[PDB]
């Protein structure tokens, strides 16, 4: 499958039980689409 990374995994107690850490390489490299509407144009502007 595309859009799916993989790594060896260390523990962290500080984040949450919900949340998961994501290293910078996965963040900067894992992409997903976002439609652009009236009210989040500002965010996508900053993004690009």
Partner 1 sequence: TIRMHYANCNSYNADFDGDEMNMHFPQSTNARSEAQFIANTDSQYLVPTSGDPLRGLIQDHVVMGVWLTCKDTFYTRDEYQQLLFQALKPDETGMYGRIKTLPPAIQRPGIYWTGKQIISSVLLNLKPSDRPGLNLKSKAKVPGK
Partner 2 sequence: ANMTPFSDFNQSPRNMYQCQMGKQTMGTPGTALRYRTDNKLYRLQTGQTPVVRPKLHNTYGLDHYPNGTNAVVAVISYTGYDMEDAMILNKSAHERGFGYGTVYKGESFDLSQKRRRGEPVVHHFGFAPGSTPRREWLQKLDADGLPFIGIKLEDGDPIVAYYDESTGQNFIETYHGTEPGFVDEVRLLGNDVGDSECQQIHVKLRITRSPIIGDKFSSRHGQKGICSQKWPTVDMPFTESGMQPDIIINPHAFPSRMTIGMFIESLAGKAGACHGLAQDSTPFIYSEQQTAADYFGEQLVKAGYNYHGNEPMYSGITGQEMKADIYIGVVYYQRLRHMVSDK
Alpha-carbon gap, residue 23 to 7, rounded angstroms: 10
Q: Please give the residue ranges that form the binding site for partner 1 (CB under 8 A).
A: 1, 3-13, 15-23, 26, 30, 32-33
Which residues within the stretch 1-48 sit at the binding site for partner 2 (CB under 8 A)? 7-8, 10-14
Question: How would you label 14-41 residue by residue, b for 16+ Cβ within 10 Å and e otherwise?
Answer: eeeeeeeeeeeeeeeeeeeeeeeeeeee
In the complex, minimum distance from the CB of residue 23 to partner 2, in angstroms, rounded to a whole number:
9
Residue 15 near which of partner 1, partner 2, none (CB within 5-8 Å, type-dependent): partner 1
């Amino acid at each position: 499958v595309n859009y799916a990374a993989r790594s060896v995994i260390s523990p962290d107690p500080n984040i949450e039980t919900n949340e998961i850490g994501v290293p910078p390489v996965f963040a900067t490299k894992l992409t997903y689409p976002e439609p652009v509407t009236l009210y989040n144009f500002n965010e996508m502007r900053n993004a690009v």
